[PDB]
Amino acid sequence: SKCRQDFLDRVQPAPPAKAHFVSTENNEPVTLHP
Amino acid sequence: ALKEYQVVGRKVPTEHEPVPKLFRMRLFAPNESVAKSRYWYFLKMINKVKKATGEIVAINEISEPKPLKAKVFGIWIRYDSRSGTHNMYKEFRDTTRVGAVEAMYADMAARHRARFRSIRILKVVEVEKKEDVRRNYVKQLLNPHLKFPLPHRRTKKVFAPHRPSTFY
Amino acid sequence: VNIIKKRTKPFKRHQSDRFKRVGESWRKPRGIDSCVRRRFRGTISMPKIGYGNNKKTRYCMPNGLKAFLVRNVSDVELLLMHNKTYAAEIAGNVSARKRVEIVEKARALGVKVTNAGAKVR
Amino acid sequence: AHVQKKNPLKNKAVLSRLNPYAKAYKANVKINSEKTPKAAGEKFLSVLHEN
Amino acid sequence: VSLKKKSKRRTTRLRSRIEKKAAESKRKQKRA
Amino acid sequence: AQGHRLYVKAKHLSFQRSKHVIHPGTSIVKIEGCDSKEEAQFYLGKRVCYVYKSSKAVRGSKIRVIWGTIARPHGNSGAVRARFVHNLPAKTFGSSLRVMLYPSNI
Amino acid sequence: IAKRAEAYEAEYRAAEREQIELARKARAEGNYFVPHEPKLIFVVRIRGINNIPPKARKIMQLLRLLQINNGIFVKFNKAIKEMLQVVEPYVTYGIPNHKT
RNA sequence: UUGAGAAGCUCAGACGAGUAGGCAGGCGUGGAGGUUUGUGACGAAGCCUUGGGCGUGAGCCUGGGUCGAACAGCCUCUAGU
RNA sequence: CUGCCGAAGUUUCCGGAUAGCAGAAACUCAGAUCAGUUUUAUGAGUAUGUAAAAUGAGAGUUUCUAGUGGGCCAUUUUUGGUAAGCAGAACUGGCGAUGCGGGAUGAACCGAACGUGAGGUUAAGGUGCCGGAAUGUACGCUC
RNA sequence: GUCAGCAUCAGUUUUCGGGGGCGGAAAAAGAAUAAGGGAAGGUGGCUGUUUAUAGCCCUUGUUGUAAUACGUCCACUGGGGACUGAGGACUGCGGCUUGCCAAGGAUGCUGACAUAAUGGU
Numbered sequence: 001s002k003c004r005q006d007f008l009d010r011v012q013p014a015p016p017a018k019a020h021f022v023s024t025e026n027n028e029p030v031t032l033h034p
Numbered sequence: 035a036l037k038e039y040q041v042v043g044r045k046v047p048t049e050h051e052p053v054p055k056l057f058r059m060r061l062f063a064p065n066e067s068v069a070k071s072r073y074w075y076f077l078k079m080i081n082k083v084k085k086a087t088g089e090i091v092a093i094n095e096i097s098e099p100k101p102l103k104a105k106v107f108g109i110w111i112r113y114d115s116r117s118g119t120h121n122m123y124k125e126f127r128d129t130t131r132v133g134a135v136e137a138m139y140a141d142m143a144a145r146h147r148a149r150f151r152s153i154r155i156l157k158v159v160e161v162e163k164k165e166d167v168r169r170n171y172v173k174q175l176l177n178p179h180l181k182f183p184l185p186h187r188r189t190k191k192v193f194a195p196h197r198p199s200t201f202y
Numbered sequence: 203v204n205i206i207k208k209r210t211k212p213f214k215r216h217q218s219d220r221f222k223r224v225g226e227s228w229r230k231p232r233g234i235d236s237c238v239r240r241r242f243r244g245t246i247s248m249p250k251i252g253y254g255n256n257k258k259t260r261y262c263m264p265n266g267l268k269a270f271l272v273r274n275v276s277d278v279e280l281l282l283m284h285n286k287t288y289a290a291e292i293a294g295n296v297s298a299r300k301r302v303e304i305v306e307k308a309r310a311l312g313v314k315v316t317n318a319g320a321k322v323r
Numbered sequence: 324a325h326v327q328k329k330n331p332l333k334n335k336a337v338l339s340r341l342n343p344y345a346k347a348y349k350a351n352v353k354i355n356s357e358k359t360p361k362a363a364g365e366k367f368l369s370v371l372h373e374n
Numbered sequence: 375v376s377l378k379k380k381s382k383r384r385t386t387r388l389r390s391r392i393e394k395k396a397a398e399s400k401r402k403q404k405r406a
Numbered sequence: 407a408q409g410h411r412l413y414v415k416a417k418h419l420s421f422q423r424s425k426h427v428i429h430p431g432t433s434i435v436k437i438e439g440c441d442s443k444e445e446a447q448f449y450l451g452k453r454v455c456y457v458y459k460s461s462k463a464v465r466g467s468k469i470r471v472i473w474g475t476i477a478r479p480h481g482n483s484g485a486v487r488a489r490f491v492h493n494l495p496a497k498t499f500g501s502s503l504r505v506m507l508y509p510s511n512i
Numbered sequence: 513i514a515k516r517a518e519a520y521e522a523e524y525r526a527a528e529r530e531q532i533e534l535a536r537k538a539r540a541e542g543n544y545f546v547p548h549e550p551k552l553i554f555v556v557r558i559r560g561i562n563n564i565p566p567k568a569r570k571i572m573q574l575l576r577l578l579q580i581n582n583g584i585f586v587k588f589n590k591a592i593k594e595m596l597q598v599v600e601p602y603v604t605y606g607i608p609n610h611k612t
Numbered sequence: 613u614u615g616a617g618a619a620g621c622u623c624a625g626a627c628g629a630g631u632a633g634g635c636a637g638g639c640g641u642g643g644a645g646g647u648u649u650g651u652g653a654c655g656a657a658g659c660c661u662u663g664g665g666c667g668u669g670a671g672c673c674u675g676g677g678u679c680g681a682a683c684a685g686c687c688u689c690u691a692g693u
Numbered sequence: 694c695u696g697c698c699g700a701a702g703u704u705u706c707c708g709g710a711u712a713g714c715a716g717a718a719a720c721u722c723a724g725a726u727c728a729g730u731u732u733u734a735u736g737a738g739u740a741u742g743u744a745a746a747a748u749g750a751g752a753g754u755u756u757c758u759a760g761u762g763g764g765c766c767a768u769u770u771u772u773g774g775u776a777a778g779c780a781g782a783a784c785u786g787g788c789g790a791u792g793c794g795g796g797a798u799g800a801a802c803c804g805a806a807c808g809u810g811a812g813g814u815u816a817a818g819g820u821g822c823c824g825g826a827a828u829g830u831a832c833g834c835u836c
Numbered sequence: 837g838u839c840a841g842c843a844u845c846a847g848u849u850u851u852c853g854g855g856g857g858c859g860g861a862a863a864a865a866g867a868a869u870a871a872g873g874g875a876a877g878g879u880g881g882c883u884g885u886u887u888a889u890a891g892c893c894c895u896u897g898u899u900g901u902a903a904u905a906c907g908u909c910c911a912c913u914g915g916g917g918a919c920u921g922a923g924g925a926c927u928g929c930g931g932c933u934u935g936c937c938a939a940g941g942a943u944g945c946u947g948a949c950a951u952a953a954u955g956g957u
Contacts, residue, residue: 003735003744013590013732013746016549019534022044022056022091024366024543029042029058031374034076034112034154040371042544056544060374091544096371097864103893137832144833162893164877178877190441190483203923208809210956213669228669230694234631234790241629241792241807251696252628252808253668263665264955271673273651273685291665294674295683298654316665317674321654324623326923327847327941331911334846336939338911340930344517345911351857354529359901363861366542371861386799398778406774423825424794431811434825447851450917465952473840477918478850481826489918491839509842511916532859539861560805560816565786566729574730574749580805580816591732591747598731611909 036062036136039069042092045083056091057081062135062155066093076154098130106161106172107134113142114152121156125169127176131158205259205266213249263289267314274300278307289314298322414439416454416503418494422480422487430493435476436485437505446479446486453506454488456498476505524610553588554612555596555605556581568599577603 039061044054059076063069070090077083106127113120124141126134135158142148161167164176174180187200216231216238218224228249231239238245254260261268267289272278273296281288290313292304298321305318331338338345376382384392419434437449456472464470474490531547538545557577564572574595576584585608586592596605 001735001743006734007745010734010745016551016588017089017546019546019548021538022544022546024056027053027056029056029370032057032059032076032080033156034080058370058373089546091546094371095860095863097861099372099861099864101865140832147834176877180877208668227671228694230669243793249669249695250808251668252810254809255668261666269666269673271685273648276649291674293651293684295651295656297652300651300654320675324928324940329847329939329941334938335911336931336937337929340939342517342911343514343930344521346931347518348521348911350910351912354858355862355901357901359862361862361901362536362540364540364542367539368861383797401779405771406779420825425819425824427794428825444852447916450851475918479917481820482829483827485826487918528858532862535860536862558816562804562806563787568730570728570730571748574728574747576749586748589732589747591730593732595731595748609908 036064036132036139037069038062038096038132038135039066040092040094040096041069041073041090043073043077043088043090045088057083060096060158062132066095069093098132101130104129106167106176107131107158108161109134109138109158110156111138111142112154112156113146113148114154115146115148118152123168125161125167125172127172131160134158203258205262205264206256208253208255213247216246263316265289265314269316272296272304275303275307278304278311278313281308281313282311285311285313289316291316292318292320412507413455414449414452414505414507416505418456418498418501418503419485420499421496430496432477432487432489433474433494434480434485435488435503435505436483437476440484440486442484443479443482446484449476449486449505450478451509451511452476453508454490455504455506456490456494456501457504458498549588550607551588552608553586553592553596553605554583554608555586555603556583557603559602564602568602571595571599572602575599575603 040058041061042056042058044056045051047054057077059073061069061072061076063072070093073090074085074088077088078085104127106125108123108125111122111124113122122142124138126137126141128134128137135155138155139150139153142153164173167173167176189198189200212226213228214226215224215229216236218226230248233239238248241248259266263269268287269291270277270281270284270288271293272281272290273293278290281290290304290308292301292315296304301320301322305315305322308315308318329337331341414437416435416437419436422429422432422434435454437446440446440449452475454474454476456474458470458472459468460470461468472490472492472494474488474494476486476488478487479485480487534545535547555575555577557572557575557580560580561578572578575586576582586596586605596603
């Protein structure tokens with residue numbers, strides 16, 4: 001059981017997303033159609 | 035009341051794709067929540083982009099630049115019917131792109147009994163030149179001397195004393 | 203704190219109207235198919251503890267006094283300190299002579315009598 | 324204690340009890356004073372009025 | 375009145391078996 | 407004869423009810439001249455009376471009255487809900503009621 | 513308490529202003545500013561206690577939504593997000609604002 | 613502040629379908645011991661009544677009528693209840 | 694007469710025991726353990742099994758003593774099929790012990806679960822009349 | 837004792853308004869006024885043309901920090917309606933200033949009516 005090892009080596013879940021800037025000058029949006 | 039929404043989104047950045055492509059759609063929905071749902075539906079069915087892997091980077095309502103200028107809008111749609119595979123093109127004359135789409139949805143649900151989820155709008159364009167108009171009823175609207183008597187007039191206070199004029 | 207009654211009608215036993223052999227005294231329906239026991243539409247009501255009246259005004263007459271059965275004058279004197287709480291009720295089998303003694307003594311004590319005018323007139 | 328529940332959103336005295344700050348709130352404030360700096364990127368306007 | 379030769383409204387047993395007929399159609403397509 | 411009738415004419419339509427269950431505590435009253443819930447707002451709180459006649463001469467008069475008050479509008483057509491001191495008899499459906507102009511707030 | 517309330521209200525106004533300035537600059541720069549993902553969710557139970565699968569019944573028991581029209585506050589995270597997905601037909605949830 | 617029938621008083625919150633089953637508290641009847649300075653020919657018991665009142669209820673009290681010799685409350689006992 | 698608690702609705706072994714569900718009695722336990730739940734991690738084949746954060750709830754045993762051991766209906770997977778029905782499982786649901794609103798009427802449909810009431814607001818379904826509520830608004834189709 | 841009317845409050849609630857922040861393309865328009873472009877479902881003119889003896893569309897400037905709609909907020913505000921009044925010396929939390937208060941649950945002012953109203957049966 002390697003999970004037991006993991007606990008021994010280890011001896012809060014990922015929070016909601018952090019706001020971050022998104023650069024579009026490098027990558028302008030491309031309009032999509034179904 | 036439908037609203038036109040610019041929805042731009044992309045998959046969450048990863049080591050394989052540190053600069054994911056940003057995809058934009060102009061799609062109509064009563065509210066932003068519906069628009070972002072419809073955007074995810076189209077993105078999944080085209081680019082196979084999972085909703086969890088993706089994220090919505092921008093949502094913006096788009097008002098009509100010229101709501102007081104009568105126009106003609108041509109709409110290409112993917113009609114879902116008994117066979118579930120049909121393409122249609124329709125033209126509506128009005129002053130707003132939202133109004134034309136609302137008329138489009140009402141017309142299709144009326145004539146072809148197609149629901150909102152079955153219908154997917156492919157593209158909406160503004161036919162500015164009278165010549166590209168393909169519909170005879172629309173062309174009769176663009177005639178210069180358009181004039182016609184008002185149809186479908188029909189007009190608590192029950193028990194009226196006299197008879198209705200129902201005329202001029 | 204006025205006297206409030208949650209209900210004025212009695213709880214008549216089911217089908218007691220149709221049959222004379224079935225008295226009006228309430229009997230709990232034991233039939234596993236009794237529609238009234240199941241509380242169907244339009245059925246008559248059944249006694250419930252929720253129908254119970256306020257403990258403060260329970261056992262009280264419309265005048266606000268509780269009835270106390272009195273057999274002779276000695277019982278009347280027992281209501282000396284509770285004349286604002288209790289009303290004397292003379293027993294049915296108390297004779298006319300003792301009624302006049304009970305009523306007169308109750309008048310002196312300022313104690314209400316529920317049936318002071320009976321067999322006394 | 325507390326025989327009756329009084330709503331601070333309707334009872335001013337109860338709100339004053341609960342919040343010793345509502346007496347100095349000043350909800351309506353001039354923040355868009357001076358001039359309004361119309362801030363709309365030309366790139367953003369083009370993509371907005373695109374397609 | 376109605377000018378029809380049959381009652382357009384069926385019996386509850388008749389509509390119940392129609393949902394069973396709809397069940398049969400699902401059986402024909404899915405498994406049968 | 408045109409010097410009286412300081413009241414508004416109304417009709418006792420029915421009781422506040424569902425399809426099968428009636429609630430006789432409150433009645434539905436159609437005030438004539440009132441054709442919307444906005445107009446019904448004017449008559450809210452007015453005093454409505456049911457006037458009837460009896461054989462016995464109580465107080466030396468054969469005219470009896472049941473009082474009541476308009477409470478809230480009922481529906482979009484201008485009918486209102488009224489609560490009377492004595493719940494109106496079910497035989498008075500379609501009978502004439504009198505809506506007073508008081509308590510006035512004009 | 514008055515000083516704490518003043519600090520909290522000033523924090524709310526500063527956060528609202530900060531988000532608005534952050535959006536305005538990106539719009540002016542032509543770039544896209546994603547808002548913060550909501551940490552708080554308000555959940556209202558819309559369906560009653562009748563005809564519920566046992567899995568959903570257990571989840572709404574953990575959410576303490578034992579009655580119709582009952583609302584609670586939840587911290588929005590992975591375990592909450594998927595639990596709300598299971599009972600999604602039975603409740604409605606959204607991001608509450610300060611007035612709510 | 614008198615509100616210690618401590619088996620009493622008081623404050624607060626939640627809850628209320630319910631078969632089989634389980635548990636608790638009450639109503640009523642015949643008789644027995646105790647008690648009420650108990651009721652009664654100036655009317656007991658019973659009966660009748662579109663009289664009144666009390667109890668969620670089982671039931672209880674009472675007015676009027678009829679009636680004519682006995683009966684009840686409370687505490688316990690008992691059962692052909 | 695009233696009140697309170699309240700099932701099982703069937704495994705597992707030879708009609709009986711064991712267990713399960715419900716209570717009682719007597720214990721220890723709150724720096725503790727649980728869960729018809731979800732995440733995280735490990736492997737293995739979108740699921741699986743194992744282990745370790747979220748949320749909720751005080752969580753545990755022992756004795757001993759009642760009642761229960763059916764069925765019906767429906768979904769999904771699957772096994773065959775047959776003029777066509779259907780037949781065989783599994784699965785958890787609903788009824789069953791349960792009234793109430795709606796579906797004209799109803800064992801299985803849609804809502805909703807019950808002390809006595811006043812007020813307010815809704816679900817499902819509805820607003821021509823019977824029938825409480827728009828002979829509403831807008832766009833079409835149909836004779 | 838009964839039943840009324842009103843007022844000032846408390847609780848729950850419903851229905852109309854008024855004012856003011858903030859947000860978005862820091863609404864879109866639009867109006868007025870300067871450039872340029874294009875034309876028509878072609879006006880005056882002469883079927884064809886390019887603002888003239890009608891005008892329209894597109895872009896930019898300006899008037900601008902325009903307004904308005906919509907969304908959101910006000911510990912902003914003015915009215916109408918209905919139901920309820922549990923509790924019972926004083927404590928408490930607060931507000932205005934010993935006191936006063938809408939602050940741990942209704943009082944006040946009147947009427948009428950008992951030869952009846954109410955509550956019954």
